[PDB]
């Protein structure tokens, strides 16, 4: 399934990676001029995050490292 940009907005306040349970990273391409990072929170809500922000990069990496260790 091929979708246009899935994010309407990004969430701008830093938060702890403990609240992320799933990550999707969709590189830019014909479908969407921007890379999108979509996180699923503990309770199933989803947020998009700005891939360019340092805090976002850090939170994604911390989630990935935790998830890789189960």
Q: What is the CATH number of the domain that holds 41?
A: 2.40.50.40
Q: Which two tokens stand for residue 46?
A: 């989803």
Number of domains in the chain: 1
Q: Return the C-alpha torsion angle 15, 42, 8, 65, nearest 10.
A: 60
Question: CB neighbours of 1 closer than 8 A, spacing ≥ 6?
Answer: none
Cα–Cα distance for residue pair 53/45, rounded to 1 Å = 21
Cα–Cα distance for residue pair 50/37, rounded to 1 Å = 7
The answer to whether 51 touches 57, Cβ cutoff 8 Å, is yes
Question: CB neighbours of 21 closer than 8 A, spacing ≥ 6?
Answer: 40, 41, 42
> Which DSSP string corresponds to 5-64?
---S----S---GGGEEEEEEE--BTTBSS-EEEEEETTS-EEEE-TT-HHHHHHHHHHH
The dihedral of CA 23, 65, 11, 15: what is its sign? Answer: positive
How many angstroms is the resolution? 0.9
Q: Residue 6 sits in which domain range?
A: 1-70
- Technique of determination: X-ray
């Amino acid at each position: 399934k091929e979708l246009r940009c899935q994010c309407i907005k990004t969430y701008s306040k830093p938060f702890h990676p403990k609240f992320i349970k799933e990550l999707r990273v969709i590189e830019s391409g014909p479908h969407c001029a921007n890379t999108e990072i979509i996180v699923k929170l503990s309770d199933g809500r989803e947020l998009c995050l700005d891939p360019k922000e340092n805090w976002v990069q850090r939170v994604v990496e911390k989630f990935l490292k935790r998830a890789e260790n189960s």
